[PDB]
Design a protein around this ligand. Structure first.
Ligand SMILES: [Zn+2]
Ligand SMILES: [Zn+2]
Lengths: 142, 101, 50, 119, 209, 147, 238, 101, 117
DNA sequence: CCCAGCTCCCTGCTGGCTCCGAGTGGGTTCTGCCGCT
RNA sequence: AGGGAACCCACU
DNA sequence: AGCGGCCCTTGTGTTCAGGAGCCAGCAGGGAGCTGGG
């Protein structure tokens, strides 16, 4: 439309999810908190301008359970019950998203920090402040 | 090398001859260069092979007829005389027109 | 030829290099460097052949 | 994409309509006074342009010409009015939109001011 | 927006005169070589002010073989041409007994207008042209060899000499730019003459299909 | 780096990369990282001294082995990511002072540049005097040779 | 092709409630000079300002003037907007845009986005870049026959583009409509027809083959081109 | 007239063409076979050159037949070669350059 | 003018959007989920720097003076402390076409002065 | 004697399908099995 | 009376 | 002793040649027409 929206494609979710919805499903509702996880220096207006389209794209969903239901509905086989949808979305976010960060409960802060770091890296690439990664660089291989 | 070195040595100018021998960095850069050619061979082959097959299949039945027209298998006229001059390609030669210039 | 390339680099580092039409500055610098090195290669080749 | 441009045109027209009154309240063109020194003062070529605006612009042209004369000590006075009227008529003949007309007149004023400064 | 439009109209008129001459209609050497100044003289100079109006530019020419064969060239003022204006032109063609007409449109022609053009084909042959297509003469491009329309007798002689059926000749589409330029229809044969680097010259024939 | 060179808490295999322009330090203990040993340079001198060579010359008797070089913090394993941050001298001749120093801040030195070659290319004599595709061809043909 | 974005240094949306006094001192001075008499309806004026600053360098490079840009804005948006601009002699090139009475600020944002990319000031769409050079090889020089009867090669300027709009470029004034050509054969077929594309296909294939100095007898090329064009349309070898 | 036609066919000044019979080499062969002394006047009547070339041209047939279509197609098919033949076997060139008996 | 940041509601800490005082003709930043409101002071609700004249010196961080892979020079002493050694490098950032310009950083610890020439 | 459906035709987009050089020499493993009818 | 498929390496 | 049933591990689940170009079908829109007011 006007700007550039950031969308996360989760495992076991056949449609992309707006990133702020994922952050809220993790339990961060205030825009200030989400941006504190994504932007580490608020004196950087350019980065701030670059994230507003994502805030707008997900403006109606302002609660954790609403976002969880959103994700669960996006699931492969959504359950007609909303409770089971929320359960499935929570299971996905706790177990299938960023397992190396942690797969136990009470790991939403670590997951939020790593997801914010990913979004930050994407923003640095889009602002031309950091070079793109080379797939053939042998340091990126095992 | 140091960062942002655009000089000849850093960017792959080999200042030695094969008789003198390459330095280690020159040796590696020369290896990169040679790899490029090996790859070109190993990929161009299939691209060109497909092109050749399609050309043949598209023109395989076109031939000179006894009326000296060039026709396809459907008997459609492709050229009224082969090459527009009716000549075979093996006995022509380069010559100069003396009144043109 | 090496000293000439050094001079071109030092010129580009002081923003005294102006792009040629239809080329960004980096393309202009690469063009000049490649020209110097090609001329050197040709001159050395001619000397060897002589 | 050329169809996408058409979509934008439709949306922009819709928004204009939303911002446009149902009936165009056509403010009847003010007929110039018979004392108007403006050539073709009865013309309606340039839409949404008032004869009074032309009079004001001609007044500005008069001031510019007076400045040029006093700087260069021009002798004749009747030429001042005739020259101003001719400049205004030329500007009206050339331009086709109100804002462009005003900008052209102001540009002429700046040119005359610079010429007066030159002497 | 006025000098440019005048130049455009002059170019369209020149190309149309060349086209009419190439199709065999009678045109005087002064019309072909009419300068832009002469255009501004004969016609207006302020198309925005309605001088000239596109309705002022209509031309009517007669064939060299029979004066009864005549052709209109119309320049509709409306950028998009619909059925109504086509009916108007057909009406005046019927009134004056003119069977052929060229219509030069600005933006295009509605699909139904095209369907109408093709529907009344056998009675009235009227063809459509975008003015962008007429801003140059494509037959003067170096890539376009000389095209010549053959008469039925010539086609019969050709097929007899080479003992061919029509469907064995090479083809040209009726929608081809040069075919539209010459106004040739399905079943006609165009003779093409081009230089050759091997023979010097080479004549080929294309059947309109 | 001190701990890794002492082999106290960080095994030699561990990679530690500092991205200075960014503000990230990345430490990797994964399996599957390719690495190679390099001589450590401090100030502008090899930490490898004559005494290490003397002890290695007698490795048959005294049992002083390659592992003792690594334990004494004179050689290091560097993987590709860490190599991104290394300032590498090709030979100790690069550490010698020069009229216009090129670098003067070397952190490592190559043991010997011929170690860039694999097993088959290591039997080619004077490979630095051949066109490179020819070295590649020998690298295959040597695997086809009868012995 | 030139859009507005290629000649703008920056844009900004302010909130000017009363145009008489503006948030920018220079803007206020020049505007009030512009606001001498009621050339407008104050009621049908929005307080939202869209301020655009142009590059003197680019504007001159393309020989553009703010009058032309204002005319383009008028043509593309009409009187519903109100564009005004200062004099070119000024230190900076500026032009203010408002809307005559969705929110007006977001609407101005949408207009600015469209106006930067979709509004065309110069040139032809799809022609993204143009190069201009004097040929050194005779294959592009103009070859004439002098009155003494000799071939003579004249150096002249030719332009190479990055995209293709052959029909529009051919109709431009001062463009040679006899020699101007394209390397895109489907465009040639569309604009010039089947015999033209027959010739152009041969020339393109010859270029490819002979770029190395290699040579293939003409009858083979001619036979391929005839095979590809003999049925009245382009038959791909696929 | 041939020269004007050539100017149209090759609007660049490129005189190098591909044609069947290498006329210059044939003339050199004739000079050697018949021991032509270039430094003496020849017994070849210049009218014999004109008529000989006309007959030869009639003998070089690509499109046979006597109808007007066949005659024009034959004229076109051999046009370049006939221009070359007439400008090589000129009476003037035969008399003062090649000097054939 | 420069970029215009974003504001957060004092109550819900959500992003504040710009609204105007129709009756007063004043610019307000008003929350959209709660009902908080505020009075603006910039009056510039948007900026778009096409020319992208951004200062690379602001992005440089003084830590790069510890990078052993950067070249060092002794011919550009830093003004702030007169130390004689500096590292230099190029921008290497997209949106830098004439990016062969050098940037300098003083290598004296606790100075970290960046400059250009 | 205008208007709102209604129909018919043309565009533009997206999804789906076929194709991907010529020969030649060696090697190895795998071509089913188990519950209870 | 004599199989086949799959995969791997290699040669020009 | 031999038919059933497939084991795809997430019944829900990673890339079965990936990418490069044409054909078919659908949505969307607009021209033109016509039975009510
Ligand atoms: Zn709030
Ligand atoms: Zn300092």
């Amino acid at each position: 439309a006007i700007g550039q929206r950031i969308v996360a494609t989760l495992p076991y979710i056949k449609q992309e999810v707006p990133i702020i919805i994922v952050f809220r499903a993790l339990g961060f509702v205030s825009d200030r908190d989400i941006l504190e996880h994504i932007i580490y220096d608020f004196e950087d207006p350019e980065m701030m301008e670059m994230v507003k389209p994502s805030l707008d794209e997900a403006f109606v969903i302002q609660e954790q359970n609403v976002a969880l239901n959103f994700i669960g509905s996006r699931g492969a086989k959504p359950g007609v019950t909303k409770e089971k949808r929320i359960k499935y979305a929570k299971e996905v976010l706790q177990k299938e998203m960023l397992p190396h960060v942690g797969v136990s409960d009470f790991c939403e802060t670590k997951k939020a920090y790593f997801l914010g770091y990913m979004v930050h890296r994407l923003l640095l690439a889009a602002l031309g402040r950091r070079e793109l990664d080379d797939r053939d660089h042998y340091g990126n291989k095992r | 090398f140091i960062k942002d070195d655009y000089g000849p040595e850093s960017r792959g100018f080999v200042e030695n001859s094969y008789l003198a021998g390459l330095t280690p960095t020159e040796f590696f850069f020369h290896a990169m260069g040679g790899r490029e050619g090996l790859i070109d061979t190993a990929v161009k082959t299939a691209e060109t092979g497909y092109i050749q097959r399609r050309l043949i299949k598209s023109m395989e039945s076109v031939m000179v007829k006894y009326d000296a027209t060039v026709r396809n298998s459907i008997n459609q006229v492709v050229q009224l005389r082969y090459g527009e001059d009716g000549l075979a390609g093996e006995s022509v030669e380069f010559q100069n027109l003396a009144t043109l210039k | 030829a090496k000293q000439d390339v050094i001079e071109v680099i030092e010129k580009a580092h002081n923003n005294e290099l102006e792009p040629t039409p239809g080329n960004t500055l980096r393309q202009t610098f690469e063009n000049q460097v490649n020209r110097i090195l090609n001329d050197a290669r040709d001159k050395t080749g001619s000397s060897a052949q002589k | 994409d050329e169809a996408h441009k058409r979509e934008w045109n439709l949306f922009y027209q819709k928004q204009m309509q939303l911002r446009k009154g149902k009936d165009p309240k056509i403010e009847e063109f003010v007929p110039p006074d018979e004392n108007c020194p403006l050539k073709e003062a009865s013309s309606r070529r340039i839409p949404r342009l008032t004869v009074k605006a032309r009079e004001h612009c001609l007044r500005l042209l008069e001031e510019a010409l007076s400045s040029n004369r006093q700087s260069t000590r021009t002798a004749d006075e009747a030429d001042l009015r005739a020259k101003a009227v001719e400049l205004e008529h030329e500007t009206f003949r050339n331009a086709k939109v109100a804002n462009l007309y005003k900008a052209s007149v102001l540009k002429k004023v700046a040119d005359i001011h610079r010429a007066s400064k030159d002497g | 927006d006025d000098e440019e439009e005048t130049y455009r109209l002059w170019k369209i008129r020149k190309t149309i005169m060349q086209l009419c001459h190439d199709r065999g209609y009678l045109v005087t050497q002064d019309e072909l070589d009419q300068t832009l100044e002469e255009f501004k003289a004969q016609f207006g100079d302020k198309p925005s002010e309605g001088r000239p109006r596109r309705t002022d530019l209509t031309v009517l020419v007669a064939h060299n073989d029979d004066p009864t064969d005549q052709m209109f060239v119309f320049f509709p003022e409306e950028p998009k041409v619909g059925i109504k204006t086509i009916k108007v032109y057909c009406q005046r063609m019927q009134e004056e007994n003119i069977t052929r007409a060229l219509i030069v449109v600005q933006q295009g022609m509605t699909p139904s207008a095209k369907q109408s053009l093709v529907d009344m084909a056998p009675k009235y042959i009227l063809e459509q042209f975008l003015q962008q297509e007429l801003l140059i003469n494509i037959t003067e491009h170096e890539l376009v060899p000389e095209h010549v329309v053959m008469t039925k007798e010539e086609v019969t002689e050709l097929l007899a000499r080479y003992k061919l059926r029509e469907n064995q000749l090479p083809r040209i589409q009726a929608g081809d730019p040069v075919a539209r330029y010459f106004g040739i229809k399905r079943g006609q044969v165009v003779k093409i003459i081009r230089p050759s680097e091997t023979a010097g010259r080479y004549i080929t024939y294309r059947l309109v299909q | 780096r001190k701990l890794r060179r002492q082999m106290d808490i960080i095994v030699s295999e561990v990679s530690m990369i500092r991205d200075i322009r960014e503000r990230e330090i990345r430490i990797y203990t994964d399996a599957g990282r390719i690495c190679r040993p390099l001589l450590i340079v401090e100030k502008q001198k090899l930490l490898l001294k004559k005494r290490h060579i003397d002890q290695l010359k007698e490795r048959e008797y005294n049992n002083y082995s390659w592992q003792d070089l690594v334990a004494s913090g004179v050689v290091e394993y560097i993987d590709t990511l860490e190599e991104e941050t290394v300032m590498l001298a090709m030979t100790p001749d690069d550490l010698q002072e020069k009229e216009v120093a090129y670098c003067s801040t070397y952190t490592h030195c190559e043991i010997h540049p011929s170690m860039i070659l694999g097993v088959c290319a290591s039997i080619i004599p004077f490979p630095d005097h051949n066109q490179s595709p020819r070295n590649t061809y020998q690298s295959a043909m040597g695997k086809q040779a009868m012995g | 092709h030139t859009t507005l974005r290629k000649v703008t240094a920056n844009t900004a949306i302010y909130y000017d409630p009363n145009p008489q006094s503006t948030v920018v001192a220079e803007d206020q001075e020049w505007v009030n000079v512009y606001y001498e008499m009621p050339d407008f309806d104050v009621a049908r004026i929005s307080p939202w300002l869209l301020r655009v600053e142009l590059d003197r360098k680019h504007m001159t490079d393309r020989k553009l003037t703010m009058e032309q840009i204002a005319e383009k804005i008028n043509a593309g948006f009409g009187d519903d907007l109100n564009c005004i601009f200062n004099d070119d002699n000024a230190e900076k090139l500026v032009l203010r845009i408002r809307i005559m009475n969705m929110d007006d600020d977001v609407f101005l944002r949408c207009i600015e986005s469209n106006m930067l990319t979709d509004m065309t000031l110069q040139g032809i769409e799809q022609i993204s870049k143009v190069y201009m050079h004097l040929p050194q090889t005779d294959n592009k020089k103009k070859i004439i026959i002098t009155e003494d009867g000799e071939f003579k090669a004249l150096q002249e300027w030719i332009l190479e583009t990055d995209g293709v709009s052959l029909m529009r470029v051919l109709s431009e004034k001062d463009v040679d409509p006899v020699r101007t050509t394209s390397n895109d054969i489907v465009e040639i077929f569309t604009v010039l027809g089947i015999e033209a594309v027959r010739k152009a296909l041969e020339r393109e294939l010859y270029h490819v083959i002979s770029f190395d100095g290699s040579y293939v007898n003409y009858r083979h090329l001619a036979l391929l081109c005839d095979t590809m064009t003999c049925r009245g349309h382009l038959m791909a070898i696929t | 007239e041939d020269r004007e036609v050539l100017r149209v066919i090759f609007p660049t000044g490129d005189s190098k063409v591909v044609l069947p019979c290498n006329l210059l080499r044939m003339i050199w062969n004739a000079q050697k076979i018949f021991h032509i002394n270039p430094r003496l006047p020849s017994d070849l009547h210049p009218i014999k050159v004109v008529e000989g070339v006309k007959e030869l041209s009639k003998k070089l047939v690509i499109v046979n037949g006597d109808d007007p279509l066949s005659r024009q197609a034959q004229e076109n098919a051999t046009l370049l070669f006939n221009i070359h033949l007439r400008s090589t076997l000129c009476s003037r060139r035969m008399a003062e350059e090649f000097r054939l008996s | 003018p420069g970029f215009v940041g974003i504001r957060f509601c004092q109550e819900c800490n959500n992003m504040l959007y710009p609204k105007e005082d129709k009756e007063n003709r004043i610019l307000l930043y008003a929350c959209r989920n709660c009902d908080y409101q505020q009075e603006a002071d910039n009056s510039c609700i948007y900026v778009n720097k096409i020319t992208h004249e951004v200062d690379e010196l602001t992005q440089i961080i003084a830590d790069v003076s510890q990078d052993p892979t950067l070249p060092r020079t002794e011919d550009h002493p830093c003004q702030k402390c007169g130390h004689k050694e500096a590292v230099f490098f190029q921008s290497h950032s997209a949106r830098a076409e004439d990016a062969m310009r050098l940037y300098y950083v003083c290598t004296a610890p606790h100075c970290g002065h960046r400059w250009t020439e």
